[PDB]
Amino acid sequence: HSRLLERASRVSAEYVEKFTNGAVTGKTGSLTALPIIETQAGDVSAFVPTNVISITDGQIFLETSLFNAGIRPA
């Protein structure tokens, strides 16, 4: 998972200028990722979710009890 998620980044104008040999001088690139994981009964202590939480820059927890109660998104 690490060598997959670590590719999503933002590169400086120098890198993009070097990559295109001077065609795109001004700007800067980027790439955003939104990996999706599913947990069993809210057990975020499992193996794969623990690995993935460590790598990403955040998370957005969606709850079932909040979903039924009408709060959508949860």
């Binding site: 069993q40 009964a41 809210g42 057990d43 499992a46 009890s65």
Partner: protein
């Protein structure tokens, strides 16, 4: 008053002497008010606080009852 018995029915009677007995009625007032204050200090602190904490998070335990992981 009766030939052998005198009965005095008083709205508020205190056994002390002078006219300034508000200065001694205030002691009973303050003591009873302090007791009534500390009571409500114990009703919330002991009963209503703990008895909601116990019932707070039971559902998180009952759902994982059958899991073998």
């Amino acid at each position: 008053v009766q030939p052998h018995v005198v009965t005095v029915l008083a709205d508020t009677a205190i056994r002390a002497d002078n006219l300034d007995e508000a200065a001694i009625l205030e002691a009973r007032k303050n003591a009873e008010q302090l007791l009534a204050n500390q009571k409500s200090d114990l009703d919330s602190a002991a009963a209503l606080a703990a008895l909601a904490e116990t019932a707070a998070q039971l559902e998180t335990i009952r759902k994982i009852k059958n899991r073998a992981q």
